Amino acid sequence: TTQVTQVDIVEKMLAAPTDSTLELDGYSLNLGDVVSAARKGRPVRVKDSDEIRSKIDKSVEFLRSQTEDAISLQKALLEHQLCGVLPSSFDSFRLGRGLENSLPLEVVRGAMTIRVNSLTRGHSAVRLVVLEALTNFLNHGITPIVPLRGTISXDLSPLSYIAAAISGHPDSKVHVVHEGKEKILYAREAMALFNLEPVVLGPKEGLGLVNGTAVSASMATLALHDAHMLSLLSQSLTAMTVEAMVGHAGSFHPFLHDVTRPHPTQIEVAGNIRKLLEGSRFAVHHEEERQDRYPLRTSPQWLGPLVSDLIHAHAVLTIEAGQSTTDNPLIDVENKTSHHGGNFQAAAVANTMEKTRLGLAQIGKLNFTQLTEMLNAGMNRGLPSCLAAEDPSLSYHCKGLDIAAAAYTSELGHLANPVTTHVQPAEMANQAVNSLALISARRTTESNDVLSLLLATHLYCVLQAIDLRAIEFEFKKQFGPAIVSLIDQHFGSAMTGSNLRDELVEKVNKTLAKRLEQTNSYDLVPRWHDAFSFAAGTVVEVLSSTSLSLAAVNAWKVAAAESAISLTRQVRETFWSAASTSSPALSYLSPRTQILYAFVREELGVKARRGDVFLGKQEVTIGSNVSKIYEAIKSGRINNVLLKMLA
């Protein structure tokens, strides 16, 4: 639909407050909201309504009227569910290790937020003091430690650990930061510290808690949120690769989408890239009288299908996470009746994770092909061998990254296979079909991580590639006239009263380019002597009817190259002398892509790399720098940059 783009969605999510308290009313909770609560420690509370309180209280009352095994049964439903694996002791912990078998804290916080929001719909019949137990945990930084695996997503077990924690189970353990450091204390031990009192689960109040898809919906919401970002970064990387490659903006022309193949997201993607490329002095906007490969040229038709899936996933997950009661059985109250269904079958969130993971693998394949092309000397239209600043003979700057990019891409491929086709006949066959939503959600989450390493690698590389390209442009700017000059100083007199000027200038220059594009692997000196050497053979053809010794041309050849090698060395020192805030790239880069350049180059401190050898020094590794770009993506810091350049 040409109304609501991924960007609209990202801006909405990014607008979510982290300070103001989030109010759960059972219907307006959105994806940006759950993410702010899970990761940004946003305060959370069941909306101060009365309507909400009444329907809640009414649900409970309707049940009270239909005291013994009611509580006992709950204990029996919680017992068999606390069956997951977790480190038995703290002795197993090690530096940077220890909690691998536990669900990420943000997933648990997001799960509790979604758990409460749905219980406010007055269908579950669980006391308001129980929902409050959960919001207090969230507001006091108390997060239950729950096993990573064990659920088939009909999320009974992980949810039970949450219930056990609030109900103060003896073996229940929780996580919490106690001024300065983080600790893992027992449930009743943590609650004691914050003056919180353990709740006591009553009639059917246990199924109303352990039933549901809150844990899946939570991790899935975190994953879709991260994937949107990666999607927009991919598009930004495309625009910047079009620039570094000196490609064509025309592939993103409205006629090639809006008109001829009106897929709303093909239009959306082409529109975004078109926008990013506007005002670019790197990319080509017109031609007068040429190829440009699929990685760049077919990028909208490649990413477009993926984007609609991500937009679709967003529709599904906002309904799932903010407007659905996934418990069972459910009460109708106003109609005085209980219904037995299966709203706990998280096939909806599983379906979004399966589709997103395949999409994450398609985005990675696209960007990999663009990046590997740009890193291929015989394909990147002139750029230095491995994006090395100095002589390639002792510099292979990005070769390893080119390799790492393939490694990430391969892994995304395997990760992309479906999880939902591996359903087993669980629970004495009563749960013969289960969604496997959290397992799918977990796989998609790893794919986000792997794509992030790939895209952080691509960003690092294009930056370096456009700086180099900026250097080529600075050089060309001055060498263009210099060629004309050194020509006349050596041939003007050699032949006057002829047309041996406008022609020799046009053919020499046309021959120089032709050869220099497939000689970008040569070290500086040999490259230029090779260039004009070929250029000489061109003068011999235009100036056939002229009086000149072969030593009178060989002098023009050694002088032309000499100037080129001296020029190039000049432009280079100028660049490495000026701070990045003054980079020559900032005068060719589009105003919008210039925003990401500055973010990485200025705010993240990762600069262009000269080359250990040349510098005669081993500087902070490339990896240490890629790692910094990677971390900006995982923390989300880059999100606003992306929004700002695409808004």
The distance of closest approach from Cβ of residue 511 to a second copy in the complex, given in angstroms and rounded to an integer, is 8
Q: For ligand CIN, which is the closer residue by CB, 155 or 226?
A: 155
The distance of closest approach from Cβ of residue 209 to ligand CIN in the complex, given in angstroms and rounded to an integer, is 12
Q: For a second copy, which is the closer residue by CB, 398 or 641?
A: 398
What phi and psi values does residue 97 have, to the nearest 5 degrees?
-145, 170
The distance of closest approach from Cβ of residue 501 to a second copy in the complex, given in angstroms and rounded to an integer, is 16
Query: In DSSP terms, which residues pair with 91 in a beta bridge?
Result: none
The distance of closest approach from Cβ of residue 173 to a second copy in the complex, given in angstroms and rounded to an integer, is 10
Q: Is 418 in the site for ligand CIN (CB under 6 A)?
A: no
Token pair listed for 190: 């943590």
Q: Is 395 in the site for ligand CIN (CB under 6 A)?
A: no
Q: Nearest residue to ligand CIN, using CB?
A: 328
Number of amino acids touching ligand CIN (CB under 6 A)? 6
Burial of 219 (0-12, 13-18, 19+ CB in 10 A): buried
Q: For a second copy, which is the closer residue by CB, 57 or 182?
A: 182
Among the listed residues 61, 65, 52, the one whose alpha carbon sits nearest the alpha carbon of residue 122: 52
Cα–Cα distance measured from residue 397 to residue 395, given in angstroms and rounded to the nearest whole number: 6
Residue numbers belonging to the annotated binding site: 211, 291, 297, 328, 399, 427, 430
Could you say which of a second copy, ligand CIN, none residue 366 binds, taking C-beta under 5 to 8 angstroms by partner kind?
Answer: a second copy
Token pair listed for 509: 């220059």
In terms of DSSP bridges, do strands 338-339 and 330-331 run parallel, antiparallel, or are they unpaired? Answer: antiparallel
Q: In 10 A of CB 170, how many CB atoms? A: 8
Q: For ligand CIN, which is the closer residue by CB, 57 or 427?
A: 427
Q: For ligand CIN, which is the closer residue by CB, 110 or 300?
A: 300
Could you say which of a second copy, ligand CIN, none residue 116 binds, taking C-beta under 5 to 8 angstroms by partner kind?
Answer: none
The distance of closest approach from Cβ of residue 621 to ligand CIN in the complex, given in angstroms and rounded to an integer, is 17
Binding mask 269-308 for ligand CIN (x = CB under 6 A): ----------------------------------------
Q: In 10 A of CB 430, how many CB atoms? A: 8
Could you say which of ligand CIN, a second copy, none residue 44 binds, taking C-beta under 5 to 8 angstroms by partner kind?
Answer: none
The distance of closest approach from Cβ of residue 214 to a second copy in the complex, given in angstroms and rounded to an integer, is 13
Could you say which of ligand CIN, a second copy, none residue 351 binds, taking C-beta under 5 to 8 angstroms by partner kind?
Answer: a second copy
Could you say which of ligand CIN, a second copy, none residue 17 binds, taking C-beta under 5 to 8 angstroms by partner kind?
Answer: none
Query: In DSSP terms, which residues pair with 284 in a beta bridge?
Result: 248
Cα–Cα distance measured from residue 626 to residue 11, given in angstroms and rounded to the nearest whole number: 26
Could you say which of a second copy, ligand CIN, none residue 243 binds, taking C-beta under 5 to 8 angstroms by partner kind?
Answer: none
Q: Is 625 left (phi over 0), alpha (psi -120 to 50) or beta?
A: alpha
Binding mask 419-448 for ligand CIN (x = CB under 6 A): --------x--x------------------
Among the listed residues 507, 296, 463, 292, the one whose alpha carbon sits nearest the alpha carbon of residue 381: 292
The distance of closest approach from Cβ of residue 14 to a second copy in the complex, given in angstroms and rounded to an integer, is 23
Residues between 37 and 96 that touch ligand CIN (CB under 6 A) = none
The distance of closest approach from Cβ of residue 165 to ligand CIN in the complex, given in angstroms and rounded to an integer, is 20
Could you say which of a second copy, ligand CIN, none residue 518 binds, taking C-beta under 5 to 8 angstroms by partner kind?
Answer: a second copy
User: Which residues have C-beta within 8 Å of that of residue 634, sequence separation ≥ 6?
Assistant: 449, 452
The C-alpha angle 617, 476, 243, rounded to 5 degrees, equals 75
Among the listed residues 599, 593, 621, 594, the one whose alpha carbon sits nearest the alpha carbon of residue 609: 621
Q: For a second copy, which is the closer residue by CB, 23 or 106?
A: 106
Could you say which of a second copy, ligand CIN, none residue 332 binds, taking C-beta under 5 to 8 angstroms by partner kind?
Answer: a second copy
From residue 13, give the alpha-carbon distance in Å to each of 164, 226, 500, 646. Answer: 32, 11, 65, 15
CA pseudo-torsion sign 240, 623, 444, 163: negative
Choice from 157, 213, 318, 328 touching ligand CIN (CB under 6 A): 328
CB 539 within 8 A of CB 560: no
The distance of closest approach from Cβ of residue 387 to ligand CIN in the complex, given in angstroms and rounded to an integer, is 15
The DSSP letter of residue 331 is: E
Q: Is 210 helix (H, G, I), strand (E, B) or coil?
A: helix
What phi and psi values does residue 621 have, to the nearest 5 degrees?
-55, 160
Residue numbers belonging to the annotated binding site for (E)-cinnamate: 211, 291, 297, 328, 399, 427, 430
The distance of closest approach from Cβ of residue 247 to a second copy in the complex, given in angstroms and rounded to an integer, is 11
Could you say which of ligand CIN, a second copy, none residue 461 binds, taking C-beta under 5 to 8 angstroms by partner kind?
Answer: none
Among the listed residues 212, 185, 206, 35, the one whose alpha carbon sits nearest the alpha carbon of residue 115: 212
CB 452 within 8 A of CB 230: yes
Q: For a second copy, which is the closer residue by CB, 95 or 579?
A: 95
Rounded (to 5) percent helix, strand, coil in the chain: 60, 5, 35
The reply to whether omega before 264 is within 30° of 0 (cis) is: no
What phi and psi values does residue 35 have, to the nearest 5 degrees?
-65, -35
Tell me, what amino acid is at 531? A
Residues between 193 and 212 that touch ligand CIN (CB under 6 A) = 207, 211
Choice from 329, 382, 526, 623 touching ligand CIN (CB under 6 A): 329
Among the listed residues 245, 241, 108, 133, the one whose alpha carbon sits nearest the alpha carbon of residue 184: 108
CA pseudo-torsion sign 543, 548, 554, 556: negative
Q: For ligand CIN, which is the closer residue by CB, 43 or 329?
A: 329
Q: Is 370 in the site for ligand CIN (CB under 6 A)?
A: no
Q: Is 250 in the site for ligand CIN (CB under 6 A)?
A: no
The distance of closest approach from Cβ of residue 327 to ligand CIN in the complex, given in angstroms and rounded to an integer, is 8
Q: For a second copy, which is the closer residue by CB, 73 or 643?
A: 73
Give the rounded distance of the alpha carbon of 440 from its chain centre.
18
The distance of closest approach from Cβ of residue 244 to a second copy in the complex, given in angstroms and rounded to an integer, is 16
Q: For ligand CIN, which is the closer residue by CB, 430 or 544?
A: 430
CA pseudo-torsion sign 168, 169, 170, 174: negative
Longest Cα–Cα distance of the chain, Å, equals: 117
Which residues here bind ligand CIN, judged by CB under 6 A?
A: 207, 211, 328-329, 427, 430
